[PDB]
Amino acid sequence: TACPEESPLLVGPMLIEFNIPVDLKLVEQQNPKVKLGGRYTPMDCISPHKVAIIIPFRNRQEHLKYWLYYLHPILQRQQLDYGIYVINQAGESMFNRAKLLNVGFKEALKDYDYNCFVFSDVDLIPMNDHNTYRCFSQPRHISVAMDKFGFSLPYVQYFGGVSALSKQQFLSINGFPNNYWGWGGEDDDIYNRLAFRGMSVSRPNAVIGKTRMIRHSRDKKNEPNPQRFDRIAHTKETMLSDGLNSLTYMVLEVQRYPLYTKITVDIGTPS
Numbered sequence: 001t002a003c004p005e006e007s008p009l010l011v012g013p014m015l016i017e018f019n020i021p022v023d024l025k026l027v028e029q030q031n032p033k034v035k036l037g038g039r040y041t042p043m044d045c046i047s048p049h050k051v052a053i054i055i056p057f058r059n060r061q062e063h064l065k066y067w068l069y070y071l072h073p074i075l076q077r078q079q080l081d082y083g084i085y086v087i088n089q090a091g092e093s094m095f096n097r098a099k100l101l102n103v104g105f106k107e108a109l110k111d112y113d114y115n116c117f118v119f120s121d122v123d124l125i126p127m128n129d130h131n132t133y134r135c136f137s138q139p140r141h142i143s144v145a146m147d148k149f150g151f152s153l154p155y156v157q158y159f160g161g162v163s164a165l166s167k168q169q170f171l172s173i174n175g176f177p178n179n180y181w182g183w184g185g186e187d188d189d190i191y192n193r194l195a196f197r198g199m200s201v202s203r204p205n206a207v208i209g210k211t212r213m214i215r216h217s218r219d220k221k222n223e224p225n226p227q228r229f230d231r232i233a234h235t236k237e238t239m240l241s242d243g244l245n246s247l248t249y250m251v252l253e254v255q256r257y258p259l260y261t262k263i264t265v266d267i268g269t270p271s
């Protein structure tokens with residue numbers, strides 16, 4: 001009973017605004033089919049896409065409210081078999097987005113047999129439901145036309161915002177790097193990994209792949225990392241030593257809310 005290649009539920013372009021007062025109790029009420037932990041499976045058909053949506057997180061509860069409010073209705077319309085994971089970095093030291101994503105990959109798999117992983121910033125919302133949050137033949141870059149970049153790719157190798165890699169694709173590159181502390185460069189490092197393992201980047205066209213980013217200031221412990229340019233230069237040499245095979249972390253707590261699973265983790269500090 002495979003789901004059609006094109007979901008009959010799709011509406012196309014949508015209005016994304018951040019003025020509305022969002023209330024998770026309401027969102028839960030509006031999305032009665034999504035089960036505890038932000039889990040949903042199509043009732044009338046079998047989706048071949050089993051996706052874990054991973055969101056790196058720390059002190060972004062308000063953005064998260066909006067992300068849930070908008071994506072859950074969307075993800076259901078995309079007829080996907082998915083789960084939402086909020087990887088909350090414990091502590092107040094330097095942020096590490098890429099490491100958190102690795103954690104989400106490992107932790108999601110202990111939950112369900114996901115075959116697909118969508119890594120998404122907490123403040124990015126898609127403007128057209130045809131921009132499917134699933135995996136493809138090649139690593140997929142989803143937020144390809146961001147509002148802050150005038151709805152245009154900043155550079156052909158840009159892989160930030162929202163992306164998706166199948167389980168096999170993620171594994172072939174030894175996951176993402178764990179050694180990028182602070183803002184920047186990890187996406188470029190990941191792009192090097194893909195290219196070096198002979199993969200290419202798949203992208204929806206700019207018409208259907210626009211996203212809005214909730215406006216925000218920079219975070220105190222997520223300052224640009226001055227070592228990024230250098231790390232990008234040596235991805236080839238370091239990728240096999242820094243990623244899944246070297247990932248260490250400690251799960252401090254797990255809470256399953258009706259709309260997502262929150263996993264608080266201690267991922268160490270820069271050293």
Ligand SMILES: O=c1ccn([C@@H]2O[C@H](COP(=O)(O)OP(=O)(O)O[C@H]3O[C@H](CO)[C@H](O)[C@H](O)[C@H]3O)[C@@H](O)[C@H]2O)c(=O)[nH]1
Binds near residue numbers: 055056057058183219
């Ligand atoms: O204190 C923090 C810092 C970061 N984040 C998470 O990290 C992502 C955000 O980084 P920012 O939004 O602060 O910065 P950018 O808007 O400049 O994000 C862009 O640049 C980053 C560079 O490191 C990533 O590549 C990201 O994927 C890309 O969209 C967030 O959306 C959120 O999911 C938190 O939750 N709390």
Ligand SMILES: [Mn+2]
Binds near residue numbers: 121123213216
């Ligand atoms: Mn942002």
